[PDB]
Amino acid sequence: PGLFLTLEGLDGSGKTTQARRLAAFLEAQGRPVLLTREPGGGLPEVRSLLLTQELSPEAEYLLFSADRAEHVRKVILPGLAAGKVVISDRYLDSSLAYQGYGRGLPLPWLREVAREATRGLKPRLTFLLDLPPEAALLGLEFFRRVREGYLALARAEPGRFVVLDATLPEEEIARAIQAHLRPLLP
Amino acid sequence: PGLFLTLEGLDGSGKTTQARRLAAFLEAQGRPVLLTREPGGGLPEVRSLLLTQELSPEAEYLLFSADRAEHVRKVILPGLAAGKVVISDRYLDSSLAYQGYGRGLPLPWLREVAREATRGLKPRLTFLLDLPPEAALLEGLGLEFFRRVREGYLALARAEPGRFVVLDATLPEEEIARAIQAHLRPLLP
Ligand SMILES: Nc1ncnc2c1ncn2[C@@H]1O[C@H](COP(=O)(O)OP(=O)(O)CP(=O)(O)O)[C@@H](O)[C@H]1O
Ligand SMILES: Cc1cn([C@H]2C[C@H](O)[C@@H](COP(=O)(O)O)O2)c(=O)[nH]c1=O
Ligand SMILES: Cc1cn([C@H]2C[C@H](O)[C@@H](COP(=O)(O)O)O2)c(=O)[nH]c1=O
Ligand SMILES: [Cl-]
Ligand SMILES: [Cl-]
Ligand SMILES: [Cl-]
Ligand SMILES: [Cl-]
Ligand SMILES: [Cl-]
Ligand SMILES: [Mg+2]
Ligand SMILES: [Mg+2]
Ligand SMILES: [Mg+2]
Ligand SMILES: [Mg+2]
Ligand SMILES: [Mg+2]
Numbered sequence: 482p483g484l485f486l487t488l489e490g491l492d493g494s495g496k497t498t499q500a501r502r503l504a505a506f507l508e509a510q511g512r513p514v515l516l517t518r519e520p521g522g523g524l525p526e527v528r529s530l531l532l533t534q535e536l537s538p539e540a541e542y543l544l545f546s547a548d549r550a551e552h553v554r555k556v557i558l559p560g561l562a563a564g565k566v567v568i569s570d571r572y573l574d575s576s577l578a579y580q581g582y583g584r585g586l587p588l589p590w591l592r593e594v595a596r597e598a599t600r601g602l603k604p605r606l607t608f609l610l611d612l613p614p615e616a617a618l619l620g621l622e623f624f625r626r627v628r629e630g631y632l633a634l635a636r637a638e639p640g641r642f643v644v645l646d647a648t649l650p651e652e653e654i655a656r657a658i659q660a661h662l663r664p665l666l667p
Numbered sequence: 668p669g670l671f672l673t674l675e676g677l678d679g680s681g682k683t684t685q686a687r688r689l690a691a692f693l694e695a696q697g698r699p700v701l702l703t704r705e706p707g708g709g710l711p712e713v714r715s716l717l718l719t720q721e722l723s724p725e726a727e728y729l730l731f732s733a734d735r736a737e738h739v740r741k742v743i744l745p746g747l748a749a750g751k752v753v754i755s756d757r758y759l760d761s762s763l764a765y766q767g768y769g770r771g772l773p774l775p776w777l778r779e780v781a782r783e784a785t786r787g788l789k790p791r792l793t794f795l796l797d798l799p800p801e802a803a804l805l806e807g808l809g810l811e812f813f814r815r816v817r818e819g820y821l822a823l824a825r826a827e828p829g830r831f832v833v834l835d836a837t838l839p840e841e842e843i844a845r846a847i848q849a850h851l852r853p854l855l856p
């Protein structure tokens with residue numbers, strides 16, 4: 482069977498924390514789970530390369546997509562096929578928010594590139610950890626464009642996105658994610 | 668302004684040889700020339716990425732395209748804007764032949780990705796050094812693959828017969844260079 486879930490938001494919005502808490506909840510229920518992330522879940526070398534260089538947004542998107550293409554084929558789809566709940570800390574929506582809304586790349590192009598890269602794989606639910614940039618643990622204008630881009634995406638796909646106030650305490654956010662997830666188990 | 672030229676063909680077809688000859692030939696005529704290549708002209712580290720074992724053909728193309736996007740923006744468009752003859756040893760047609768005909772990726776997707784990557788930039792002429800596939804001898808680059816790529820290049824040449832100049836790669840180096848030069852004479856000046 483398999484269940485594909487993602488977490489999205491600005492750096493320091495609590496994604497890795499909530500990813501780790503969601504995996505733990507699922508383990509306590511006896512459900513096999515796989516935790517993964519972008520960038521680097523497909524091509525670790527893309528992550529390291531982008532850490533130290535800044536490229537055109539078009540080149541950056543394409544590297545993020547090459548990583549994503551390997552990630553879907555070698556990690557995510559095999560995980561789903563084995564019946565795992567696969568949780569990715571960032572997925573396509575990260576490219577849409579950062580390279581699209583942030584850097585100005587056209588979204589329909591981004592999605593056409595993604596179409597083969599992802600084999601059209603979409604998560605069943607996406608938890609958006611929403612907060613202002615100055616509440617996170619370029620320039621500020623960029624991060625505002627990203628944050629608002631995420632909320633734009635969420636608004637267009639209310640079936641898939643769950644928007645959470647990421648400034649709330651950690652345990653409270655975790656329980657909110659759990660409540661949304663329950664109807665899709667066991 | 669400026670003139671955009673490319674060379675294409677299989678591994679081992681002589682395109683580096685002819686690209687370098689042409690660059691020197693044009694520079695001897697007092698013409699400003701920028702000699703470049705793919706992969707690596709945009710993002711030199713992509714050659715490392717491309718070597719990754721068991722790469723999906725989709726990721727493989729996406730890596731070529733990342734390099735190409737950076738290459739066009741940072742090297743080719745500024746060279747052409749300064750009035751240079753820019754010569755690229757491989758460009759987008761390499762992807763169409765290798766990733767499209769070779770690996771089997773759908774051509775329209777390849778082109779849609781390319782459209783932003785290249786910003787629509789096409790060479791004025793492309794010199795295809797047509798080499799028999801057995802003479803060519805990434806992963807899976809055996810005979811069946813090279814046959815597909817070789818024929819792929821020939822189909823691309825037929826689809827765009829004004830852009831592509833197809834040359835017999837087995838001819839002596841000086842004969843091919845002379846043929847390339849003759850095709851260029853009407854554009855230069
Ligand atoms: N017309 C010709 N006849 C015979 N040999 C030739 C030739 N032109 C080039 N060569 C030789 O063939 C070999 C490969 O040539 P070259 O490296 O220029 O091809 P290419 O650039 O298409 C290789 P690749 O795609 O692997 O980078 C070299 O040893 C070169 O000296
Ligand atoms: C996955 C992904 C991440 N990013 C950015 C967001 C983060 O700032 C950075 C990843 O950071 P990390 O490797 O330090 O987690 O990459 C994009 O811009 N586009 C994408 O598609
Ligand atoms: C530019 C380009 C090269 N190639 C291939 C040709 C060679 O086999 C290899 C380039 O290797 P090289 O960097 O050692 O010349 O990449 C493609 O498959 N697609 C492309 O778009
Ligand atoms: Cl985070
Ligand atoms: Cl998606
Ligand atoms: Cl909330
Ligand atoms: Cl031109
Ligand atoms: Cl033509
Ligand atoms: Mg951020
Ligand atoms: Mg959680
Ligand atoms: Mg990525
Ligand atoms: Mg993508
Ligand atoms: Mg997502």
Ligand SMILES: [Mg+2]
Nearest residue numbers: 634635637638
């Ligand atoms: Mg949306």
Ligand SMILES: [Mg+2]
Nearest residue numbers: 682683684756
């Ligand atoms: Mg060469």
Ligand SMILES: [Mg+2]
Nearest residue numbers: 705706731734
């Ligand atoms: Mg390239």
Ligand SMILES: [Mg+2]
Nearest residue numbers: 732735781784
């Ligand atoms: Mg391309």
Ligand SMILES: [Mg+2]
Nearest residue numbers: 673758759760
């Ligand atoms: Mg070309």
Ligand SMILES: [Mg+2]
Nearest residue numbers: 823824826827
């Ligand atoms: Mg053609």
